[PDB]
Amino acid sequence: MAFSKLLEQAGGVGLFQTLQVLTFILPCLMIPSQMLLENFSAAIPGHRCWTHMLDNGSAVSTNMTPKALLTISIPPGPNQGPHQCRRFRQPQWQLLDPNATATSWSEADTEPCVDGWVYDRSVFTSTIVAKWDLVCSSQGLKPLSQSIFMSGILVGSFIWGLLSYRFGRKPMLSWCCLQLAVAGTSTIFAPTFVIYCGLRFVAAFGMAGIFLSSLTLMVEWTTTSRRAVTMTVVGCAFSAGQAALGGLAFALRDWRTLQLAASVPFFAISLISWWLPESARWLIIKGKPDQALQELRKVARINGHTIEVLMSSVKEEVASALDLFCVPVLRWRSCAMLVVNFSLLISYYGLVFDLQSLGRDIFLLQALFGAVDFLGRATTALLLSFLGRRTIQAGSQAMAGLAILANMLVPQDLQTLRVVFAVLGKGCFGISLTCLTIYKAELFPTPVRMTADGILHTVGRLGAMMGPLILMSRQALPLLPPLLYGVISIASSLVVLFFLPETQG
Ligand SMILES: [Cl-]
């Protein structure tokens, strides 16, 4: 750990580290708005088929109320309202006499919606759903779009992982900011949903590069004693951005203006990120010690206070920089950690992307999700001060699964209690995630802590990709996604009890 001593000698607690954290707070504040945008920009408004008798103003007989025309023009659907995707071929005038038994019409009188849809614009002025008619049959493309975005983060993280050995961390950060900004603003001009999804993929690829460069540069320029505090501050910045998205969507409500508000700040952040210095340690490993020493002298000058000694002192640590699968105890602990992290991230992203189903007011729910993650972190710290890691992890993940199942049990009325259970489940996943982040570091020794974290992270992003894809199944079985998230959360809590060891703590 000789580079940490060099950073201490360079002033590991100076003005530079604060300015660096603030500079990285800007993208961590803005990333949730881009990542979770589709909860608002792809909100499904109330909709029905266009029908000549109801929607062509020249055919509206002056003597009928719009409610009567709706009743005679659209059959009741499974839920308490007009059926969203089908109309009668001819107006069923027989359906207006109050003495007619409600079964006088057949399914044979219905057809799929052929002439498109008329959307209620009272709640949302425009969505991508209303732009490309993604309902009843095409409803799977929204969570598919979110899944494509998560796949963009996965592929980006992999490709940028490989490219990070050759290419530098400052220009990669700048390029990824520019790429995300350009692709994000370009999405408003997409003529087809396919072009939209492709631009979202390219945006997520850039976001993946943002995540990699920000975390790597931050850890590499923060001393080990401060890494945990800095990571906590970054988590709080992420949570502030998550809360701010609810207010931003409340402020504009137009998907195009919201997309601009999410994408243009990454244009502004790219130039500031261009001001940032490159990693001196990376420069050393690449065999560029003169530039690394120049960067150390620049940082030490900015924080307000010799050659050959630096590179010689860290030679062995750079030089030093399998048993996990052959050895049965490690095999089983590894497998357990992959299943738990996979099931956790599947349920976390299922919940965060399921916003329109969890509450009628998605803006309040998003704000509460940020507030309760903050509250969750404060109590995770309290729980860790009183209790142990395994019990809190298992209990929190079980409470999250129970909260999802309870949400499935809540009638549409009493919206506040449904919001309470959804917010509780989100908070529980926030605590479980922070516990898991600590517990991974405590369970694995450094050579395999590092080997394990790469595979765990890639399996977790696979989980993140699988979340919205399971959410796609709602069109056939509406109760299946939250049921799955509940049962998988409970089952992985059982995995924790049976398969993870008790530790010294
Ligand atoms: Cl990632």
Same domain, 312 and 333: no
Torsion over CA: 259, 262, 268, 270 (sign): negative
60: Cα within 13 Å, side-chain hemisphere: 12
Query: Alpha helix locations (H) across 303-445?
Result: 309-320, 323-326, 328-353, 355-358, 362-386, 389-409, 415-443
Distance 5 CA to ligand 1 centre (A): 29
Non-local (6+) Cβ contacts of 415 within 8 A are 359, 360, 361
Same domain, 260 and 350: no
**CA pair distance 68, 64, nearest whole angstrom:** 6
Domain end point (choices 266, 299, 321): 321
Give domain status of residue 156, yes or no: yes
Which experimental approach was used here?
A: cryo-EM
Distance 117 CA to ligand 1 centre (A): 38
Reduced 3-state DSSP string for 23-56: HHHHHHHHHHHHHCCHHHHCCCCCEEECCHHHHC
Same domain, 233 and 379: no
**Six token digits for residue 163:** 């490219």
Same domain, 354 and 461: yes
Distance 203 CA to ligand 1 centre (A): 14
From the list 503, 382, 494, the residue with the least C-alpha distance to 440 is 503
Distance 434 CA to ligand 1 centre (A): 16
Distance 107 CA to ligand 1 centre (A): 48
290, 295, 304 from 9: Cα distances, Å: 18, 14, 12
**Six token digits for residue 147:** 């899944």
Same domain, 110 and 72: yes
Distance 458 CA to ligand 1 centre (A): 8
Domain end point (choices 253, 288, 321): 321
31, 239, 341, 376, 464 from 433: Cα distances, Å: 18, 13, 9, 10, 13
127, 184, 266 from 180: Cα distances, Å: 21, 6, 7
Distance 157 CA to ligand 1 centre (A): 6
Residue 64 phi/psi, 5° resolution? -115, 135
**How far from the centroid of its chain's Cα atoms is residue 40's Cα?**
13
Same domain, 344 and 468: yes
Distance 430 CA to ligand 1 centre (A): 17
* Rg of the Cα atoms in the chain: 27
Distance 461 CA to ligand 1 centre (A): 6
Same domain, 416 and 472: yes
27, 36, 244, 499 from 31: Cα distances, Å: 6, 9, 11, 35
Query: Alpha helix locations (H) across 74-186?
Result: 128-132, 141-163, 169-186
Give domain status of residue 129, yes or no: no
Non-local (6+) Cβ contacts of 120 within 8 A are 45, 46, 47
Beta-carbon count within 10 A of 302 CB: 14
Distance 155 CA to ligand 1 centre (A): 9
Give domain status of residue 344, yes or no: yes
Beta-carbon count within 10 A of 295 CB: 21
- How far the first Cα of the chain sits from its last, in Å, is 24
Same domain, 100 and 179: no
CB-CB contact of 463 with 488 (8 Å): no
From the list 439, 441, 366, 358, the residue with the least C-alpha distance to 404 is 358
**CA pair distance 375, 344, nearest whole angstrom:** 19
Give domain status of residue 194, yes or no: yes
Same domain, 80 and 95: yes
Which residues, listed in sequence order, are joined to residue 119 by a DSSP beta bridge? 47
Distance 209 CA to ligand 1 centre (A): 9
26, 34, 451 from 209: Cα distances, Å: 15, 14, 20
Distance 183 CA to ligand 1 centre (A): 19
Distance 22 CA to ligand 1 centre (A): 21
Non-local (6+) Cβ contacts of 372 within 8 A are 423, 424, 426, 427, 430
Give domain status of residue 127, yes or no: no
Give domain status of residue 41, yes or no: no
Burial class (CB in 10 A: 0-12, 13-18, 19+), 108: exposed
**CA pair distance 67, 60, nearest whole angstrom:** 12
Burial class (CB in 10 A: 0-12, 13-18, 19+), 4: middle
Burial class (CB in 10 A: 0-12, 13-18, 19+), 63: exposed
Structural domain of residue 232, as residue ranges? Answer: 1-27+136-321
Same domain, 305 and 192: yes
Distance 4 CA to ligand 1 centre (A): 25
Domain end point (choices 321, 346, 373): 321
Give domain status of residue 77, yes or no: yes
Residue 88 phi/psi, 5° resolution? -75, 140
Distance 439 CA to ligand 1 centre (A): 19
Distance 457 CA to ligand 1 centre (A): 7
Distance 419 CA to ligand 1 centre (A): 29
CB-CB contact of 347 with 202 (8 Å): no
Q: What is the resolution of this structure in A?
A: 3.1
**CA pair distance 95, 74, nearest whole angstrom:** 10
Distance 464 CA to ligand 1 centre (A): 10
Distance 66 CA to ligand 1 centre (A): 51
Beta-carbon count within 10 A of 445 CB: 8
The number of distinct structural domains making up the chain is: 3
Distance 208 CA to ligand 1 centre (A): 6
The strand ranges marked E within 34-183 are 47-49, 86-88, 110-112, 117-119
Distance 418 CA to ligand 1 centre (A): 31
Same domain, 13 and 52: no
Distance 104 CA to ligand 1 centre (A): 56
Non-local (6+) Cβ contacts of 165 within 8 A are none
The letter for the amino acid at 411 is: P
CB-CB contact of 130 with 185 (8 Å): no
Give domain status of residue 412, yes or no: yes
Distance 229 CA to ligand 1 centre (A): 20
* Unique residue bearing structure tokens 């696979």: 462
Residue 446 phi/psi, 5° resolution? -45, -45
Torsion over CA: 340, 346, 351, 352 (sign): positive
Distance 460 CA to ligand 1 centre (A): 8
CATH number at residue 499: 1.20.1250.20
Distance 169 CA to ligand 1 centre (A): 16
C-alpha dihedral, 304 to 307 to 312 to 317, nearest 10°: 30
Same domain, 180 and 258: yes
The letter for the amino acid at 161 is: G
Q: Most distant CA pair in the chain: distance in Å?
A: 98
